[PDB]
Amino acid sequence: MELWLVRHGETLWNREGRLLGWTDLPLTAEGEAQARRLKGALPSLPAFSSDLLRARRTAEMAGFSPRLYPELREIHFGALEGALWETLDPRYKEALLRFQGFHPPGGESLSAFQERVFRFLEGLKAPAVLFTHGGVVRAVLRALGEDGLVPPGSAVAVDWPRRVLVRLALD
Template sequence: MKNTRVVLLRHGQSVWNKENRFTGWANVPLSEQGEAEARNAGVKLKEQDFQFDACYTSMLDRAIKTSNLALEQLDSLWIPVQHDWHLNERHYGNLQGLNKAETAQEFGDEQVHVWRRSYDVEPPQVSDDSKYYPGNDRRYEGIDHSQIPHGESLKDTYDRVLPFWNGTVVPNIESGSDILIAAHGNSLRALIKYLDNIADEDIVDVEIPTGSPLVYEFDEQMKPVKSYYL
């Protein structure tokens, strides 16, 4: 019996990635380069004869567009796609929209490094009336406001990604489905931390390139037996 495969795909470069801005839950589009990266990811997957049974994405356009562009290369736009906020990027709070270099000049490199790379330190929180508070976005109308973040650490992101993985994705994998997950740098880092049992202090050094399919193969006990980039 073949190993079941899950492909983790960080969205292609976004406009704010290009501009070196904190993005978080801000709904910014892919850049031209990002669209090309997403299509190229689909080409790589096609070359390796991947065929997916289902796809999961976040609620943000850059991940949704990435999954669409990749699946189009595989003639698989017809497969079931579930959009879920648990796969959203880490919410960067009041840092969202700010240029990372300018923020470092204002608050110091060390403080910005702590906000960006520490495991359990949250950024400055947005207020309920902020344009970056997700409770004011129609996408999230059905979510209890007690669950909607004002700003998250990577640990917070981990704590919302894992229940979705175990409760929604794993049962689909156990049925033998090959899965594509198109999401974000931090939501995927949270998942990789779990799958590879990476320590809190070590996950801060893990980087996931945009538009590069990361394949995990699972045995019948749902244990990852192999992982590799295409």
């Protein structure tokens, strides 16, 4: 199934290097610009989006009117929301790097996060564009055997659940 996953435009915590999950930050000026550039670069397909501001706003500026689904939200970092990556305990950095065994206090485990994301994707019965977050895109890319790192305001098209089709980044 052809699915286009879009990572929302940048927020302040991107440059700051802080874990950004359910904290509802707005897009930066550049983030809005990144979103605008997506308009005309994404196919005209039904759209879905994380209900968090940065995602919804990216969808809007990209020319879409997506249906909102909390299932497309970034992982909930719980007590680690806003934590500087730099000062993250080595155990947490390792869990996030290897994408396994991560369960922050008051948050969501990486296993539950994957279950949520994949169950949502499994329910899509036709091609669509999904405005989401870096962690969601990474979960999908990793599950497809590829490095899940893509810049803010960039997109990746995949044939779920078989392979990555293309990665799109604009300057």
